[PDB]
Design a protein around this nucleic acid. Structure first.
Ligand code: FES
Ligand SMILES: [K+]
Ligand SMILES: [Mg+2]
Ligand SMILES: [Mg+2]
Ligand SMILES: [Mg+2]
Ligand SMILES: [Mg+2]
Ligand SMILES: [Mg+2]
Ligand SMILES: [Mg+2]
Lengths: 113, 294, 170, 216, 50, 126
RNA sequence: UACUUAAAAUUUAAGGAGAGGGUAUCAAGCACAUUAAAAUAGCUUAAGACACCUUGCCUAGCCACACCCCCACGGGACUCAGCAGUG
């Protein structure tokens, strides 16, 4: 069960496109140090990921797992997880639906619905 | 047999540290070196006292005494005598093991002589080659010329004894004959001219007092400690003398009379002092000044 | 005057002051913080002051930050095993956040010292070579050894020009 | 990148060249032919070393001996003049397979296989024989086989263990004392595991190279 | 006389050097195994997980 | 360069200036240049006597043992150096050459005695 | 080089955290994508694609070249960019 050669064994990014069949185009960003300014800026990379169930929508944050063998020239990752769904975020700390910096369902309540 | 006290014995280190003393201004005297602009901090009386405490902690590490060891024994061991190689070489070969993680006193440094004998490198040969391959800041491959008696006497005239000793520690090994020679020459010069103050608040004071105690010539250091109002130090010196010479007449006299404090110094004067008459006179004069003024 | 606010953040000394060196397991650190609020002030200060120091010591870790997506700020680390470590940094100072992450996912001082010594194993003081790699280029530099002919002329008898002349004379 | 482009001519050349080599492979009768007047190989022009001149005129090749025998001398014993002169103990090959060079007009070039018995010690398996094209081979007569192959092994007298070198011995004894091992045993090297064959021992013909087929 | 004496020196010298090359070859593999799967190696691996 | 074939070797790399030789003991692929790319430096050899009349050899005996254990060959000058140190047995040709030098000086001593005897005959003639 | 199986040196192939010359009057490239019933219409690009121009760089050294046609079956204008030397 050897792992991939690619450095990006785990990458987080935003789904910037989903027009290919069973594949989601994801934009990841990393921080790179400008040597002259000594300030960090964002370098963005595109990763094709295998979305077997076509469960991805543009704008949602996702976690990708490097495939052991590249599926194609560009598809070398799969959709491990959807960290945040676009417009359907669930607060990790409390577990309640949220809509921005607000709770759609109060954490005091226990709807269990 | 009651063990002879050692230099590193926790009791000896306590007494030697006390008589040495501490002086943050002398211990941290400004170095004549490339300088940088000073920094400044606003501190309360508590913060300042904390900073002074750290300075005293650092002054303790700075005053750590250098080892006092006995003279090493010449290395004279022949590993082999391959006579087939006799006359085939004109110069000696010196082979040094330069594996990084070996202590320098556990490295194999051998010499193949022209006669064919394979022998271990002598102590002088070991120190030279270890400097050539593991160079130590402060040490030079060849013995410097400042350690010649004429050159050393010049340093003594300038009252640079702490420098002669700091150089002797950078260049020579503690167990070498050259190390012992220079130290015993500096300590002897301090004695004759009563320059004991030069090595106070320095790491070299302990070895000097150690040398005097073993050589039974603490008279000068006691006379000088008393005249400087350091009579607690003089008493501690007489305790160290009664510790390294337990069977001495002075040590047995103090047990008989259970002497303590100033009594210990008076006992030493009568029994084993080379110049007892003066120790009492200086001790008496100190008592008169203390009693008369206070 | 250096541009921006707190230009000290753009100096190598400040970037090197960071003490959080993550374990090899750490692969991603997402930072979820809010730009407005009162309980998220430490999170905002952590992004402003500390994220540069963390990235500087952990260049291979992906730090991705999301703004105003949740009611409260939190940190989520993604490890190589597949584990996800959630940290809640609400009502927590930026200094508190750094100490927390250092404890749970930061290498200890002992481990870092061992790595430094291992890195320098192949440098030997006795080794001779260029200044970039070695202290001394040639044995002529060592005291007592034969000096370089360029600086000091060699004795005639030690020269091939002289030795060749004698062989012809023989 | 993407401006790196294919090299078809290089691909075509490599394959074509390799194909020609297989088609025009030379034979042993050509590679190992000799002109005895000059002692130089016509295929390559290589002049034999001087120490081989006497034997090239005075000794026979292996398949010159075997071409005169029924079944190309399968089962016969063959020795080399070089071995006879160097080693008192019997050295010979027991022939098992023999592939003559049919192209040769006298069937005097080819390959052979057999079981080696060097200095009285016999190998357990058959392998190809090296130096078959040398002028050094002597067929053993059938009536003399029993006397030739008679060998009685002597007790081995070459030392099995030797001292360590002077410096390496002191480093071993020093480590013993450091680790607390107190002993006066002398470090000894064991030579049994690493004993060398004689320099003239037959080598592996299967892994040996063959000369190319381009004439000089 | 000298050719034979020299031929024997080469055989005996090369046997001694082969024994030493083997001794060195074993220390390399022993040291490698201790680092890879020594006592200390195993403890640190579990200590980290705990 | 991109070498194909060859083995690691322990050899002496020549440094210094004209009439001032100095050697670096190094482990290197055999096809590399004498003073070029190496794998590790295993010591140094200064063949010129120093102020004390000592030729100085430095050997990293821990790394040397490591590379001999991994197949590193030895050059003949380095085999001679290890023999003088005592780490290896004396090389066969070191012993043979020492014997040749002994036989060559014996002839010279005998010839000088013969010349002195011939000179003695001249003394007898007067 | 050891074992008849394991330690190296040295390469090769496929890759990618990041870094990597100039011109934007080079602003579009034109198959450059995914799926795997063989359909879908996608892929790169002002965060600089594509095009063109220039340059050995990564410096214990590395890379490329070896008369010319990127290559070298073949062909041609048919060999010192090894040392010395010549026009
Ligand atoms: S640089 Fe060392 S001899 Fe010249
Ligand atoms: K070309
Ligand atoms: Mg041969
Ligand atoms: Mg224009
Ligand atoms: Mg040309
Ligand atoms: Mg070409
Ligand atoms: Mg030229
Ligand atoms: Mg040429």
């Amino acid at each position: 069960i050897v792992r991939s050669s690619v450095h990006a064994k785990w990458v987080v990014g935003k789904v910037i496109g989903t027009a290919m069949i069973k594949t989601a185009k994801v934009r990841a960003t990393r921080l790179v140090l400008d040597p002259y300014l000594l300030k960090y800026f964002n370098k963005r990379k595109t990763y094709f990921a295998h979305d077997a169930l076509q469960q991805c929508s543009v704008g949602d944050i996702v976690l990708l797992r490097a495939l052991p063998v590249p599926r194609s020239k560009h598809v070398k990752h799969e959709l491990a997880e959807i960290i945040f769904k676009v417009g359907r975020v669930i607060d990790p700390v409390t577990g309640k639906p949220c809509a921005g910096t607000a709770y759609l369902e109060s954490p005091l309540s226990e709807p269990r619905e | 047999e009651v063990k002879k006290p050692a230099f590193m014995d926790e009791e000896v280190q306590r007494i030697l540290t006390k008589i040495t003393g501490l002086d943050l201004q002398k211990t941290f005297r400004p170095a004549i070196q490339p300088l940088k602009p000073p920094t400044y901090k606003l501190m309360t009386q508590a913060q300042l006292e904390e900073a002074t405490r750290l300075a005293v902690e650092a002054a303790k590490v700075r005053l750590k005494m250098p080892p006092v060891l006995e003279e090493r024994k010449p290395i004279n061991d022949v590993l082999a005598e391959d006579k087939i190689l006799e006359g085939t070489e004109t110069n000696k070969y010196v082979f040094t093991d330069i594996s990084y993680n070996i202590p320098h006193r556990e490295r194999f440094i051998v010499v193949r002589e022209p006669s064919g004998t394979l022998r271990k490198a002598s102590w002088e040969e070991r120190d030279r080659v270890i400097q050539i391959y593991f160079p130590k800041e402060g040490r030079r491959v060849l013995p410097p010329v400042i350690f010649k008696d004429e050159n050393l006497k010049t340093m003594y005239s300038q009252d640079r004894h702490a420098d002669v000793l700091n150089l002797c520690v950078a260049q020579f090994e503690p167990d070498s004959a050259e190390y012992i020679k220079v130290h015993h020459q500096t300590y002897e010069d301090i004695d004759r001219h009563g320059k004991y103050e030069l090595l106070r608040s320095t790491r070299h004071f302990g070895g000097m007092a150690w040398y005097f105690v073993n050589k039974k010539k603490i008279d000068g250091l006691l006379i000088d400690q008393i005249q400087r109002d350091l009579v607690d130090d003089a008493t501690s010196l007489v305790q160290l003398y009664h510790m390294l010479h337990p069977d001495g007449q002075s040590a047995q006299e103090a047990k008989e009379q259970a002497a303590e404090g100033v009594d210990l110094i008076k006992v030493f004067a009568k029994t084993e002092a080379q110049r007892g008459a003066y120790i009492e006179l200086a001790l008496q004069t100190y008592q008169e000044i203390v009693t008369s003024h206070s | 005057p250096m541009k921006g606010r707190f230009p000290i953040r753009r100096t190598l000394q400040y970037l090197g002051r960071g003490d959080v060196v993550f374990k090899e397991s750490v692969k991603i650190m997402t930072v979820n913080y809010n730009t407005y609020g009162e309980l998220g002030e430490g999170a905002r200060k952590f992004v402003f002051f500390n994220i540069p120091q963390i990235q500087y010591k952990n260049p291979w870790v992906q730090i991705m930050m999301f703004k105003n997506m949740t009611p409260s700020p939190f940190l989520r680390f993604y490890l190589d095993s597949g584990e996800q470590v959630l940290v809640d940094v609400e009502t927590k100072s930026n200094k508190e956040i750094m100490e927390h992450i250092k404890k749970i996912l930061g290498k200890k001082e002992e481990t870092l010292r061992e790595e430094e010594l291992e890195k320098q194993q192949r440098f030997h003081p006795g080794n001779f070579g260029p200044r970039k790699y070695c202290l001394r280029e040639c044995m002529c530099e060592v005291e007592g050894q034969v000096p370089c002919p360029g600086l000091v002329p060699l004795p005639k008898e030690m020269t091939g020009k002289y030795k060749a002349a004698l062989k012809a004379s023989t | 990148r993407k401006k790196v482009r294919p090299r078809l001519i290089a691909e075509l050349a490599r394959r074509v060249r390799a194909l020609r080599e297989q088609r025009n492979q030379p034979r042993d009768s050509q590679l190992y032919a000799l002109d005895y007047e000059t002692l130089t190989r016509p295929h390559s022009g290589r002049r034999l070393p001087v120490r081989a001149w006497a034997d090239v005129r005075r000794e026979s090749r292996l398949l010159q001996l075997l071409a005169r025998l029924p079944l190309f001398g399968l089962g016969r014993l063959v020795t080399r003049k070089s071995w006879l002169w160097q080693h008192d103990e019997p050295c010979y090959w027991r022939l098992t397979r023999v592939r003559p060079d049919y192209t040769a007009q006298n069937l005097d070039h080819g390959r052979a296989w057999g079981i080696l018995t060097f200095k009285g010690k016999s190998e357990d398996t058959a392998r190809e024989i090296e130096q078959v094209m040398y002028h050094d081979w002597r067929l053993v007569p059938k009536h003399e086989e029993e006397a030739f192959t008679a060998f009685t092994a002597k007790p081995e007298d070459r030392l099995n263990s030797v001292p360590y070198p002077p410096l390496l011995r002191a480093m071993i004894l020093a480590e013993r004392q450091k680790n607390g091992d107190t002993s006066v045993q002398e470090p000894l090297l064991n030579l049994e595991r690493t004993r060398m064959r004689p320099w003239d021992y037959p080598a592996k013909q299967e892994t040996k190279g063959r000369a190319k087929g381009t004439p000089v | 006389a000298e050719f034979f004496v020299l031929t024997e020196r080469y055989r005996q010298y090369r046997e001694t050097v082969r024994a030493l090359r083997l001794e060195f070859t074993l220390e390399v593999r022993r040291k490698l195994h201790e680092a890879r799967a020594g006592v200390l190696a195993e403890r640190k691996a579990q200590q980290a997980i705990t | 360069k991109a070498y194909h074939g060859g083995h690691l070797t322990i050899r002496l790399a020549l440094g210094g200036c004209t009439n001032r030789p100095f050697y670096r003991i190094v482990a290197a692929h055999n096809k590399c240049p004498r003073d070029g790319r190496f794998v590790e430096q295993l010591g140094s050899y200064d063949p010129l006597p120093n102020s004390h009349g000592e030729k100085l050899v430095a050997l990293n005996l821990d790394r040397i043992r490591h590379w001999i254990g991994c197949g590193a060959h030895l050059s003949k000058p380095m085999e001679k150096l290890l023999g003088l140190s005592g780490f290896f047995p004396l090389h066969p040709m070191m012993i043979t050459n020492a014997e040749r030098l002994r036989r060559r000086r014996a002839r010279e001593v005998l010839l000088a005695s013969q010349k002195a005897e011939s000179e003695a005959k001249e003394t007898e003639a007067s």
